[PDB]
């Protein structure tokens, strides 16, 4: 038998992982049959922390939990209600560990939008109806911080739509101080922001459909305004009025519209604020100190760190995090060097006439993330090993002597593991390696000094079984040389792939700015089924615009968001035809989200290479998508800037060319990210041009189309289309 569509949809063969929460420097928490257990890495033993009977107290309504830093209180999340990608609503209740009972006095209210423990100690802050609250002791009344909150207008301590999605990648917009004296938070005003309005039909019992509306700044429209504040939590009393204090400036960014795009506490009276203009080629990192004699946070021009880019935009999607040292003088930051390569370089708290930073890495590769920073060493991930951009390995570097650069996960299992993700302890004396691919995922615990594997946490032995009678596909990671430079690709080849024979080709495409589809990770997804059962080669290609390969490749599509990554996906297909194992008459392409836009543009190009293709929730033109993301790569839709390419990079302009192909357009009606409008315009243009196509809407489904039945329906519907396109059924 083969890896059938049913096996993917019903999820019979489950790829396991090992989630753990580092509580101490040598202790973590892990789940087992709904019983959270405490593990001490000092020895090889485990102690019972909190039983399944405790979570059972609320039934199956427990969605998540969160233990306090002092290990005396547990935050029990329940009645989970999703909103957008990261935002959600839930009820809460605190569990005491010593007394072993619930705290039923001064409770957390219903529909709490966010909660957080402090960095150190059992302090609680939370957002409710767009207003921030502080709770010093779980049993004591909460002190109200803000009273300006209003639904979809004024947000206190939480992000609106665009900030949640494109900036922080999270709903929370508040940050506790290290010891717990202060509580920083951002405030957003959506008064000028226009509303997207779509219909929600709900269950069939609902007679009249509800009109959902969201403050949504489309490209060129009025954005939200931001305001940063800090409130002293140690001075909160019901006798005196709680008065937060606002950090103004920088003067350079406040010339026009701007964004708050990161914040990190350095010390108890020092904090770094990352800012960014609407034209996202100018970022300022202002470090500010608390003047306790006048109760105002001072932000001098000497402690500012400017970051700019002539070729495109700052960072990959945003200016990276600064990792400060314990004392709070030096901070490390992933920045593009003179050759155009993302590398770690050291800054001090004071700036320099021309802020040159000492790059601790110089090679022709990029640093992915800074995982930890100790007193004498630094942990980071890079794509250096075997010169593969799609690879991930853990590296260790010394601050004093930069030449000491040891790899931690390179040769642990070089065949099975070429893609790692790490979860370090507090001071990084123990760590967990997360082997993702290309073999069966493997998870192991380690000691920092000896690099010695303590044990095997999860090796997918159950997944090793079950797949004993299945025709497993094989992943092939490789590259080609185009125009004096490498371009890596991926291929999920059918089982027992024969080079002499010809197969149907499907181009799996996303190809967004700083995207990477060609990697060494293992996945049991829809592509696995198409190779295992239908004998279809599912390929992927990272052309010009893709990331982790320098800023020459990534910024090639600056102000040109639908041209090079369109043509490079066509060229990639032509190169696969030359290899001699692809049927030229049965070549297709499919993509979700940005991939839908690329798919649609590829089909609209009229190259003659692709027979059919499927666009799922595609962007149609860039004026319809949000401002932050769109204006990062494109300009503003004005004659003064870049309106001409806005008008030329639309899908519906190329509607006449769809007569040469078979097109399947899919889109969820309640999509808050890429609105149903976009496909609605595409389809209307195809109708006017007199070109026949296939369509499918999904009632009340959002961008993910992640409802169980809707997920089963779309991938089953797409399979029928692909069988009919290649003449299989």
């Amino acid at each position: 038998r083969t890896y059938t569509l049913a096996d993917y949809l019903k999820n019979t063969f489950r790829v396991k992982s090992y989630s753990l929460r580092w509580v101490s420097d040598s202790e973590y928490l892990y789940k087992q049959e709904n019983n959270i257990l405490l593990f001490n890495a000092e020895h090889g033993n485990s102690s019972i922390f909190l039983e399944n009977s405790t979570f059972e107290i609320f039934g199956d309504s427990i969605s998540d939990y969160s233990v306090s830093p002092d290990r005396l209180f547990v935050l029990l999340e329940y009645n989970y209600v999703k909103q957008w990608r990261h935002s959600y609503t839930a009820s809460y209740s605190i569990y005491d560990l010593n007394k072993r009972q619930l705290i039923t006095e001064e409770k957390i209210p219903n529909n709490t939008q966010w909660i957080t423990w402090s960095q150190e100690g059992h302090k609680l802050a939370y957002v409710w109806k767009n207003d921030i609250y502080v709770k010093i002791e779980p049993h004591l009344p909460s002190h109200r911080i803000t009273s300006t909150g209003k639904e979809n207008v004024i947000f206190n301590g939480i992000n609106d739509w665009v900030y949640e999605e494109e900036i922080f990648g999270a709903y929370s917009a508040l940050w506790w101080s290290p010891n717990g004296t202060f509580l920083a938070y951002a405030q957003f005003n959506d008064t000028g922001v226009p509303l997207i309005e779509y219909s929600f039909y709900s269950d069939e019992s609902l007679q009249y459909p509800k009109t959902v509306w969201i403050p949504y700044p489309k490209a060129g429209a009025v954005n939200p305004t931001v305001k940063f504040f800090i409130v002293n939590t140690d001075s909160l009393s019901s006798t005196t009025t709680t008065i937060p204090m606002q950090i103004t400036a920088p003067a350079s960014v406040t010339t026009g519209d701007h964004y708050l795009c990161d914040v990190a506490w350095v010390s108890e009276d020092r904090i770094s604020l990352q800012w960014l203009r609407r034209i996202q080629n100018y970022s300022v990192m202002a470090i500010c100190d608390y003047d306790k004699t006048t109760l105002v946070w001072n932000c001098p021009t000497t402690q500012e760190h400017i970051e700019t880019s002539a070729t495109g935009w700052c960072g990959r999607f945003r200016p990276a995090e600064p990792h400060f040292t314990s004392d709070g003088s030096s901070f490390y930051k992933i920045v593009s060097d003179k050759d155009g390569y993302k590398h770690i370089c050291q800054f001090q708290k004071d700036r320099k006439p021309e802020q040159v930073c000492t790059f601790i890495t110089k090679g022709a590769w990029e640093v992915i993330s800074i995982e930890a920073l100790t007193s004498d060493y630094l942990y980071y991930i890079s794509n250096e090993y075997k010169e593969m951009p799609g690879g991930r390995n853990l590296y260790k570097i010394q601050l004093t002597d930069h030449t000491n650069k040891k790899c931690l996960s390179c040769d642990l299992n070089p065949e099975r593991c070429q893609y790692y993700s790490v979860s370090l302890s507090k001071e990084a004396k123990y760590y967990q390696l997360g082997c993702r691919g290309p073999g069966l995922p493997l998870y192991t615990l380690h000691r920092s000094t000896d690099q010695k594997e303590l044990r095997v946490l999860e090796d997918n032995s159950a997944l090793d079984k079950m797949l004993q009678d299945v025709q497993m596909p094989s992943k092939k990671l490789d590259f080609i040389v185009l125009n004096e430079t490498r371009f890596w690709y991926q291929m999920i080849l059918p089982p027992h792939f024969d080079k002499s024979k010809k197969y149907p080709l499907l181009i799996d495409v996303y190809a967004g700015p700083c995207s990477q589809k060609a990697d060494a990770a293992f996945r049991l997804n829809w592509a696995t089924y198409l190779a295992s059962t239908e004998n279809i080669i599912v390929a992927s290609f990272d052309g010009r615009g893709s990331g982790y390969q320098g800023d020459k490749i990534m910024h090639a599509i600056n102000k040109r968001l639908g041209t090079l990554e369109v043509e490079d996906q066509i060229e990639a297909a032509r190169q696969f035809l030359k290899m001699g194992f692809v049927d030229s008459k049965r070549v297709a392409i499919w993509g979700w989200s940005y991939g839908g836009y690329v798919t649609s543009m590829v089909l609209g190009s009229g190259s003659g290479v692709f027979k059919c293709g499927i666009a799922v929730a595609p962007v149609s033109r860039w004026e319809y998508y949000d401002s932050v993301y769109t204006e990062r790569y494109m300009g503003l839709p004005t004659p003064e800037d870049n309106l001409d390419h806005y008008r030329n990079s639309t899908v519906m302009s190329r509607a006449e060319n769809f007569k040469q192909v078979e097109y399947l357009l899919i889109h969820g009606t309640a999509d808050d990210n890429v609105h149903f409008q976009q496909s609605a315009q595409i389809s209307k243009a195809l109708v006017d041009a007199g070109v026949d196509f296939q369509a499918m809407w999904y009632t009340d489904e959002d961008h993910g189309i992640a409802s169980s039945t809707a997920h089963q329906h779309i991938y089953s519907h797409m399979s029928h289309f692909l069988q009919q396109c290649f003449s299989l059924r």
Partner: antibody
Amino acid sequence: EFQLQQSGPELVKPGASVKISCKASGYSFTDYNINWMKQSNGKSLEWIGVVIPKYGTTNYNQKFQGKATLTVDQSSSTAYIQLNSLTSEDSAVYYCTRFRDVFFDVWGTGTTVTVSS
Amino acid sequence: QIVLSQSPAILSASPGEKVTMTCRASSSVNNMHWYQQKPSSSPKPWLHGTSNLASGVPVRFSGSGSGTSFSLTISRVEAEDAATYFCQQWSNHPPTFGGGTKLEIDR
């Protein structure tokens, strides 16, 4: 095999309080949890609260927070519910049930409790 | 919390016939449970996880569903099956009950 048994029927005057037990035997009493219910003579059921015999941790319904109080004796393997300050509205049948971290898989005999002058 | 609505109060069907049973929620439910109660007796556990049988429940009883409309089917109703049924929810705390599904028999 697993048996649950409560005290007999009861009568009390308005303003008074009552207590009714739920003795259990067979399974390891400390492992599984105890939940209590309420049902009027001709109405639907109503959830009151829940206890874990091991630590004696309680969690009540908001509707019965300032009325019912739950306790347990793990040596005798007997759970209790303590109804404070009754009225004519409290006249109903009460049940004690066990939870298998899934649903109410074990049930007691059931006990009618009347409140009248 | 979640107001479950049983459909309808009393329902009759002859011995050996099909009998379907549904519990309509207001918000949403991940996993619906069911309970049988004979008059003047304690409720008994019937179907947990919507489909799976309890320790002692016969094989003719089985259910399914999702969202705000779950179900429970009874293959060939017997004389002993004449008893009131209730649907239970606990995907959201506090847990709630139905109202009345009195399984009548047509003789």
